[PDB]
Design a protein around this ligand. Structure first.
Ligand code: CHL
Ligand code: CLA
Ligand code: CLA
Ligand code: CLA
Ligand code: CLA
Ligand code: CLA
Ligand SMILES: CCCCCCCCCCCCCCCCCC(=O)OC[C@H](CO[C@@H]1O[C@H](CO)[C@H](O)[C@H](O)[C@H]1O)OC(=O)CCCCCCCCCCCCCCCCC
Ligand SMILES: CCCCCCCCCCCCCCCCCC(=O)OC[C@H](CO[C@@H]1O[C@H](CO)[C@H](O)[C@H](O)[C@H]1O)OC(=O)CCCCCCCCCCCCCCCCC
Ligand SMILES: CCCCCCCCCCCCCCCC(=O)OC[C@H](COP(=O)(O)OC[C@@H](O)CO)OC(=O)CCCCCCCCCCCCCCC
Ligand SMILES: CC1=C(/C=C/C(C)=C/C=C/C(C)=C/C=C/C=C(C)/C=C/C=C(C)/C=C/C2=C(C)CCCC2(C)C)C(C)(C)CCC1
Ligand SMILES: CC1=C(/C=C/C(C)=C/C=C/C(C)=C/C=C/C=C(C)/C=C/C=C(C)/C=C/C2=C(C)CCCC2(C)C)C(C)(C)CCC1
Lengths: 31, 30, 337, 32, 160, 68, 30, 71, 481, 36, 37, 30, 27
């Protein structure tokens, strides 16, 4: 079900996970 | 034109006026 | 139907929308939500994506992104270049002409974040109003929150509008805020403006009031409708320690409300004054006394010299659009005095 | 004469109307 | 045909798209006046149109230009008059104000719109039900025609 | 209580202030109001962008040199 | 400057006279 | 209404690693530099330019930035 | 009883005394206008309108009187700088006296309306209690406002009946009151176009009278009536305060950035004209044209009017003042009395050196004489500091073209340093610093003071709008819970 | 302990008018000499 | 012309008087140095 | 100094007189 | 006489504080 709380949580969370993966990849590179 | 004359005149105008207004308001309220 | 009042009116689309929006749930949406949620969400997203990927190698000549190796403290969302002046910098505007990459390079994210954030604060205040009306309470929270809105408007909108452009507005970052603070100290003597003095007094007094109230309530509790602490004992203690003490809960809590709001409003007025370069910079009598007599020296003169040093040693790199090249012999120095 | 800035501004107005209508239709669909 | 167009009045033509004269229900927490207003506006419109046409025909000066030459020198039908602008405006305001003030002091709207009496020299009104109504429709139609004609004249005066 | 002071000017203007609490049932003409608000917002955006040099038109120059 | 002061003093005195004449305490039981 | 059952921890155990790998590939492949225009560590200073670039223009910014970015 | 901040709420349900207090405020405002005009005329010095304009003497009300056509005085002088013939009733003193008389009449009317308040006009015919039909009063007042706006825009600014408004050339050299023809089209929204004033006022008056008729004829809907609380008077106050600070923001922004409604010959130049080198570019273009014609340097530089060179000077920049540097500009750096001329700095080799102008944002700026390509060539070192490119070492010589000092060349390093410091600010001018005992620090233009005051008022009024809207939309709980 | 000797001062409107008139007249008379 | 029902009296207790006097004197202390310049 | 001294004197005197008048009005009715 | 007026203002503030401390109205 696409309830409002589900929408809020997913909208906050998905970019957070994407950005955390990106930042870890940045940590991998030299600088 | 001196500051002393103007300030003395202003104080003499204002301070007794304030005192009299205080007393009159006290009387009228009672 | 709907009982509007004296007469009953048939329900309408608006009635259904209002009924759904005000329905109780985990996150109270309300009518104000339509304006608050999108604007605030986009402001936060823009800030995070700007600090993560977007650079400033062209607007300021500085690297201010995680991708370039910056820390959390140094990363920031830089303002657009001074060439843009006061352009609203729409992505569809003449500056970028739709190109997202060039729009990010020119620094449109700052304007995007600032505008969406200001509308988000307006929506948040409307949300406070709506919730207070729903719960049937006095909306003193909105009047209290008016002060942050005034500070944000005066610092992030009015000040750049009165200045050369958006370039001199604060940039969203931990280190950029310190740069802005030192910039005001140097070029404005902002520490001497009486309105900033009022703001400092208000904020410190608010912190003092918070600490006193918390400690006093927590130290006069009753052992266990009726109150949880003894007002009489606290009043006696503070009357015999400090000299004066509160005797009315209403007055105490209203004072707690009143102090910080007044402090911030006076600070906002001072910043508005600075926006037009109307500064409380110097005392002419002290200046002429120092000029005539070289041996006369006070702490105000030392502050003036420090401001001169700040300006001269910062302007070379802080304002690249001026293209300033100061020779070593014109830079103010202590030994040359 | 229609300058590129004016055309872009008209497109922006159309987009704003589109997003407002999207919000309105979402509210209408959910509320019903 | 609109329901509020009850007929039995000279200007009935079924033209009221916006429902200005449409009655509406009210909650607490007229056609005669509008007909009178149309009548008066139309009367002045025909007067102005006839005057402008006659002035253009006889002396030839433009109606829009009239007033500039009059201020420099007063003249009617090519004959000078010994009046200045101050006396002219004073006489005009006094006489027109008197005529107005006598005009609106009528509690009866039927006489307010249609005073008759001395203003009708010939006994044309009488008590006829058809011919009088037909001529009344003629007056209202010519009033509308004059109003639209003078609006056209005013539009053409601008941008020329 | 007793009726207030009566003055010819007051009686002349009496019909104006004699319809308090007088409303139309339903929503009335709110849609027209919304349309006009939208139009006014569009016009305000027009003039704001013109004044800000973010909307450039051929005829307008937006400069002190337009006083020529 | 001094002329303005004299004018202010005279105007104030006249105003006091006017107030005393008009805004007086109504006399009762003479 | 908290639901931390195994159903949650198995349905959400596939998409989350997918997002993490997607972000890692986004940074590694070089799409991050292309999309956002951030210069690479070997492109900050080109052959013709050896200092911080300056915009010094408003309505010519687009092609000027294109020219001074090495493209 | 009422606390000290609720005293003026006794007239919240009494229309007569509300009218009385509003009349009293109007009388106070008119009296202030008259008194300020009288004081300004008493202090104003119309001797020199070139180097001592009205905006230089700290005149606030005089520019606003002059903007709409008041250009003569009973003293025998005009703001242009010529002898005044048949000044008529509408002069500066006449306007001040008229405002004072109006203030007195309004005071008397306020007293009358305060004394007699129980009027049958304010009583509801049905209930018999005090009431106001707010939509109908709004309709009447909007009708009047639209009529007045149309009249002003069609008879005053257009010059059909009135005198016109002040219009000037782009560089503010030849300006005067003229009729302004309406400009319908894409322009008019061009802020610096005077025809926009007439076109806007005519169109807005027509729309305002139409809207007044509509609001006069059509009653509001019940949903809107309850939503906006049209039965209460405080919502009117909140909405009025909202519109008021909106207008204050708009006017302050228009003043600060300049417009056709704020000519620079009445309020002074703008910060952004000094930032972008407006007058400097105009002067350079004119002198270059004269040089290309065939004239020498001296005669070409002599053709530049003193007014144009005066505008190109950082002293008149409204962003160089201070918050507590009160008074007129003349108290700041003396009274301008003459133009020395244009200073050209040349090293011993022969290269022409240009002094870098101080940015409008620095309190103190080091003086630097740059090359033609921007390379630094000379500079006065910091006080008592070892130097390598000082004036004495490089050997810079200054020569003046046009103005008071024409054809005079100086080689003494002291006077060269002095004139370099003077030219750092822009054009060099002779100043009388003894008449007013001027301090030596720049003050701010009336433009800056107006902008500062009105932005501060607008912020305070935004807070007032918030507070009064909250009070009117929460009246049930604000009834004293 | 409360003082039995407690009294209040009164000043009717006539006294206020007299005092204001006296001080303003004295100021008018002596202003010329004070300014000199 | 009759006794106006909207009749009320303003009050100001001693605490308010002290607050006002302190505010006035503190503002004067803060701004006197600036005003004298 | 005349401007500043006059402004300071007025700012000290007039609001204090107003506050004292209000307080004396209040204190009259016990 | 600037020092004099500064001292007078400071002493007035101190006197107000003292009067508020010692001459407060009873509850
Ligand atoms: C009421 C309708 C009315 C209309 C449409 C006009 C129309 C006009 N008058 Mg006019 N006037 C009108 C009433 C009156 N005028 C005047 C006296 C004048 C003068 C002196 C002048 C005008 C002028 C004008 C023109 C420019 C304004 C315009 C054609 C001007 C003109 O003629 O310019 C071409 C002009 O100089 N009018 C008087 C007083 C007798 C009027 C009384 O109602
Ligand atoms: C001010 C002049 C005026 C007034 C008061 C009226 C009033 C009336 N007319 Mg008349 N009419 C007029 C001008 C006017 N009309 C003109 C110029 C024409 C020619 C186009 C007509 C043609 C006409 C016809 C053919 C009919 C009417 C009818 C009516 C009645 C119902 C419509 C109504 O309420 O209008 C009220 C009008 C107003 C309050 C004027 C509003 C004007 C606004 C401000 C617009 C102005 C700008 C405009 C676009 C140009 C009413 C008695 C109908 C009738 O008899 O119904 C009983 C009918 O059949 N009229
Ligand atoms: C309300 C309508 C109206 C108005 C405002 C005017 C107003 C005017 N007319 Mg017009 N006129 C009108 C109706 C009107 N007339 C009519 C109905 C006729 C036909 C008989 C004329 C025929 C007419 C002529 C032939 C002339 C004027 C002239 C004039 C002007 C000066 C003479 C004057 O005021 O009359 C004074 C009347 C005294 C009885 C004046 C601007 C004269 C002019 O120079 O203006 C163009 C002129 O030569 N009018
Ligand atoms: C040209 C068209 C026309 C027509 C057909 C009529 C016809 C009529 N009018 Mg109208 N009238 C006209 C022009 C006209 N008049 C003009 C130009 C004026 C202005 C002076 C008037 C002013 C007027 C009034 C004031 C009255 C009439 C009356 C009458 C009636 C007698 C008759 C139906 C009278 C009426 O209604 O009869 C009782 C009446 O009271 N008319
Ligand atoms: C917004 C309205 C406005 C604006 C923009 C101006 C602008 C100006 N006025 Mg005008 N004036 C105004 C309203 C305004 N005035 C009013 C309402 C009055 C009547 C009281 C006057 C009376 C007046 C006179 C008599 C004179 C001026 C002068 C001036 C000029 C000097 C600038 C100035 O005031 O420095 C002063 C600016 C400040 C002091 C800034 C105030 C900063 C804060 C708000 C002060 C807060 C103090 C606070 C209460 C604490 C007080 C402490 C206590 C010790 C006093 C300038 C053009 C002078 C001039 O050059 O004209 C020839 C002049 O002589 N004005
Ligand atoms: C159109 C403007 C307007 C109007 C008509 C009102 C009217 C009112 N306000 Mg609102 N208000 C306004 C603007 C306005 N206000 C603004 C801009 C603000 C933000 C600062 C406020 C903040 C405000 C609050 C917080 C409160 C009110 C209250 C009131 C009511 C009582 C008035 C009062 O305080 O007693 C009379 C006030 C005094 C005797 C004190 C005056 C001392 C001032 C501060 C110093 C002197 C100023 C100077 C002489 C004049 C400055 C002129 C300047 C505006 C140009 C009254 C209905 C009160 C109310 O009814 O709430 C229950 C209330 O609590 N107002
Ligand atoms: C209180 C609550 C308010 C909540 C507000 C929430 C946000 C509202 C939306 C944001 C509004 C942004 C407005 C941008 C205005 C702008 O870009 O100005 C930029 C332009 C001026 O543009 C300037 O013009 C100058 C003329 O010489 C120069 O050419 C400059 O180069 C040029 O930048 O101004 C306007 O477009 C609008 C003017 C009127 C609005 C004034 C606003 C306040 C001005 C303060 C003045 C100094 C103090
Ligand atoms: C009460 C405080 C009064 C301070 C006066 C200080 C003084 O000495 O002034 C001194 C000045 C006059 O100053 C004198 O002017 C003379 C003119 O010939 C000479 O130039 C003198 O050299 C100069 O000293 O007095 C004023 O101008 C007062 C004007 C009132 C203020 C107007 C501007 C207000 C702008 C902000 C308003 C809103 C603020 C909102 C804040 C919230
Ligand atoms: C040994 C310790 C000695 C301590 C000495 C110092 C004590 C200071 C006492 C300050 C009293 C201030 C006036 C209170 C006026 C007064 O009577 O308040 C009375 C008030 C109590 O009010 P009530 O509760 O009775 O109010 C009832 C309601 O109906 C409202 O009236 O007390 C407070 O508000 C507490 C806030 C104190 C705020 C203190 C601020 C201190 C500012 C100091 C400024 C220094 C300037 C120096 C210049 C040189
Ligand atoms: C701009 C843009 C946009 C938008 C965007 C967005 C919306 C985004 C979002 C974004 C986002 C939404 C992001 C997020 C992020 C997040 C993050 C980045 C996080 C982080 C975290 C952290 C960092 C953590 C920390 C911690 C913790 C919590 C644990 C403990 C400890 C610590 C502290 C470590 C738009 C479309 C409009 C337009 C175009 C582009
Ligand atoms: C009765 C009459 C008369 C007389 C009249 C008169 C003479 C009047 C006057 C009047 C006046 C003579 C008025 C005045 C006024 C003034 C004012 C009203 C002022 C105000 C001010 C203000 C308000 C300010 C404020 C402020 C300050 C202080 C500074 C800045 C800040 C502020 C803003 C706060 C006669 C017999 C002839 C005739 C008949 C009638």
């Amino acid at each position: 079900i696409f309830t409002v709380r589900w929408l809020a949580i997913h909208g906050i969370a998905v970019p957070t996970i994407f950005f955390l993966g990106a930042i870890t990849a940045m940590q991998f590179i030299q600088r | 034109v001196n500051i002393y004359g103007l300030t003395a005149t202003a104080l003499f105008i204002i301070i007794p006026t304030s005192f009299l207004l205080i007393l009159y308001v006290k009387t009228a309220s009672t | 139907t709907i009982a509007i009042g004296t007469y009953q009116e048939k329900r309408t689309w608006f009635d259904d929308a209002d009924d759904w929006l005000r329905q109780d749930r985990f996150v109270f949406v309300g009518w104000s939500g339509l304006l608050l949620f999108p604007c605030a969400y986009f402001a936060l997203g823009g800030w995070l994506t700007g600090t993560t990927f977007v650079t400033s190698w062209y607007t300021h000549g500085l690297a201010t992104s995680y991708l370039e190796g910056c820390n959390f403290l140094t990363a920031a969302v830089s303002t657009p270049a001074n060439s843009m002046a006061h352009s609203l910098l729409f992505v569809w505007g003449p500056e970028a002409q739709g190109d997202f990459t060039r729009w990010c390079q020119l620094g449109g994210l700052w304007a995007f974040v600032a505008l969406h954030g200001a509308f988000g604060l307006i929506g948040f205040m409307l949300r406070q109003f709506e919730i207070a009306r729903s719960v049937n309470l006095r909306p003193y929270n909105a009047i209290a929150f008016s002060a942050p809105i005034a500070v944000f408007v005066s610092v992030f909108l009015i000040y750049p509008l009165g200045q050369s452009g958006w370039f001199f507005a604060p940039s969203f970052g931990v280190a950029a805020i310190f740069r802005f603070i030192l910039f005001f100290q140097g070029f404005h003597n902002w520490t001497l403006n009486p309105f900033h003095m009022m703001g400092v007094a208000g904020v410190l007094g608010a912190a003092l009031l918070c600490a006193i109230h918390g400690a006093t309530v927590e130290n006069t509790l009753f052992e266990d409708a009726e109150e949880t602490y003894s007002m009489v004992t606290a009043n006696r203690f503070w009357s015999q320690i400090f000299g004066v003490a509160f005797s009315n809960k209403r007055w105490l809590h209203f004072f707690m409300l009143l102090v910080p709001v007044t402090g911030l409003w006076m600070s906002a007025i001072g910043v508005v004054g600075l926006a037009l370069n109307l500064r409380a910079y110097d005392f002419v009598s002290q200046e002429i006394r120092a000029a005539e007599d070289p041996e006369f020296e006070t702490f105000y003169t030392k502050n003036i010299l420090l401001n001169e040093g700040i300006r001269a040693w910062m302007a070379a790199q802080d304002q690249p659009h001026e293209r300033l090249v100061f020779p070593e012999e014109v830079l103010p120095r202590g030994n040359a005095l | 004469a229609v300058t590129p800035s004016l055309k872009n501004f008209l497109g922006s107005l159309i987009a704003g109307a589109t997003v407002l209508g999207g919000i309105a239709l979402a509210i209408t669909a959910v509320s019903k | 045909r609109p329901e509020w167009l009850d007929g039995s009045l000279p200007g009935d033509r079924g033209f009221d798209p916006l429902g200005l004269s449409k009655p509406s229900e009210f909650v607490v927490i007229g056609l005669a006046r509008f007909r009178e207003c149309e009548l008066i506006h139309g009367r002045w419109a025909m007067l102005a149109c006839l005057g402008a046409l006659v002035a253009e025909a006889t002396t030839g000066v433009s109606w829009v230009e009239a007033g500039k030459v009059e201020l420099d020198g007063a003249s009617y039908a090519g004959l000078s008059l010994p009046f200045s602008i101050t006396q002219l405006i004073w006489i005009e305001v006094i006489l027109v104000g008197g005529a107005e003030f006598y005009r609106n002091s009528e509690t009866n709207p039927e006489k307010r719109c249609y005073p008759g009496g001395v203003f009708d020299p010939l006994k044309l009104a009488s008590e006829d039900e058809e011919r009088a109504f037909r001529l009344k429709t003629a007056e209202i139609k010519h009033a509308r025609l004059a109003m639209v004609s003078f609006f056209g004249y005013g539009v053409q005066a601008l941008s020329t | 209580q007793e009726p207030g002071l009566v003055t010819p000017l007051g009686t002349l203007l009496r019909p104006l202030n004699s319809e308090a609490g007088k409303v139309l049932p339903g929503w009335g003409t709110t849609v027209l109001m919304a349309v006009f608000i939208l139009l006014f917002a569009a016009f305000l955006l027009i003039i704001l962008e013109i004044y800000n040099s973010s909307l450039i038109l051929d005829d307008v120059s937006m400069s002190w040199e337009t006083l020529a | 400057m001094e002329a303005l002061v004299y004018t202010f003093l005279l105007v104030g005195t006249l105003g006091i006279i006017f107030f005393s004449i008009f805004f007086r305490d109504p006399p009762r039981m003479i | 209404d908290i639901l931390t059952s195994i159903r949650y921890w198995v349905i959400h155990s596939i998409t989350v690693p997918a997002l993490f790998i997607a972000g890692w590939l986004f940074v590694s492949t070089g799409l991050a530099y292309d999309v956002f225009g951030t210069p690479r560590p070997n492109e900050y200073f080109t052959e013709d330019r050896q200092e911080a670039p300056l915009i010094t223009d408003r309505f010519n910014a687009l092609e000027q930035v294109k020219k001074l970015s090495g493209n | 009883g009422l606390p000290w901040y609720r005293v003026h709420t006794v007239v919240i349900n009494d229309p007569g005394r509300l009218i009385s207090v509003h009349l009293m405020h109007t009388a106070l405002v008119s009296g202030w206008a008259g008194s300020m005009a009288l004081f300004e005329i008493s202090v104003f010095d119309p001797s020199d309108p070139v180097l001592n304009p009205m905006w230089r003497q700290g005149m606030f009300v005089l520019p606003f009187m002059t903007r709409l056509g008041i250009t003569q005085s009973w003293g025998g002088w005009t703001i242009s700088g010529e002898t005044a013939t048949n000044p008529g009733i509408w002069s500066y003193e006449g306007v001040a006296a008229a405002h004072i008389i109006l203030s007195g009449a309004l005071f008397l009317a306020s007293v009358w309306h305060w004394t007699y308040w129980d009027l049958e006009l304010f009583r509801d015919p049905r209930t018999g209690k005090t009431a106001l039909d707010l939509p109908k009063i709004f309709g009447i007042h909007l009708f009047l406002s639209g009529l007045l706006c149309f009249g002003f825009g069609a008879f005053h600014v257009t010059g059909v009946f009135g005198p016109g408004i002040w219009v000037s050339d782009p560089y503010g050299l030849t300006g005067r009151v003229q009729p302004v023809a309406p400009s319908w089209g894409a322009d008019g929204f061009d802020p610096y176009n005077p025809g926009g004033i007439a076109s806007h006022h005519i169109a807005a008056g027509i729309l305002g009278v139409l809207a007044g008729l509509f609001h006069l004829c059509v009653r509001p809907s019940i949903r809107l009536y309850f939503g906006l609380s049209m039965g209460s008077i405080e919502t009117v106050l909140s909405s009025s305060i909202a519109a008021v600070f909106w207008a204050a923001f708009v006017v302050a922004g228009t003043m600060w950035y300049g417009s056709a409604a704020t000519p620079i010959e009445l309020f002074g130049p703008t910060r952004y004209q000094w930032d972008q080198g407006f007058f400097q570019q105009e002067i350079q273009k004119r002198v270059q044209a004269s040089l290309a014609e065939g004239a020498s340097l001296s005669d070409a530089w002599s053709r530049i009017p003193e007014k144009l060179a005066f505008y190109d000077y950082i002293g008149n920049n409204p962003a160089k003042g201070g918050l507590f540097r009160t008074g007129a500009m003349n108290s700041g750096d003396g009274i301008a009395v003459g133009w020395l001329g244009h200073a050209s700095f040349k090293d011993q080799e022969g290269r022409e050196l240009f002094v870098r102008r101080m940015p409008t944002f620095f309190e103190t700026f080091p003086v630097l004489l740059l090359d033609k390509d921007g390379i630094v060539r000379a500079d006065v070192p910091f006080r008592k500091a070892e130097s390598k490119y000082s004036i004495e070492q490089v050997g810079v010589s200054v020569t003046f073209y046009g103005g008071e000092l024409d054809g005079l060349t100086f080689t003494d390093p002291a006077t060269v340093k002095k004139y370099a410091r003077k030219a750092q600010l822009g054009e060099i001018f002779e100043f009388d610093r003894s008449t007013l005992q001027s301090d030596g620090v720049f003050r701010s233009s009336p433009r800056g003071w107006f902008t500062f005051g009105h932005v501060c008022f607008a912020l305070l009024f935004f807070f007032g709008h918030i507070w009064h809207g909250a009070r009117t939309i929460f009246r049930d709980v604000f009834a004293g819970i | 302990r409360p003082n039995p000797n407690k009294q209040v001062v009164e000043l009717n409107r006539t006294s206020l008018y007299w005092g204001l008139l006296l001080i303003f007249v004295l100021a008018v008379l002596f202003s010329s000499y004070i300014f000199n």
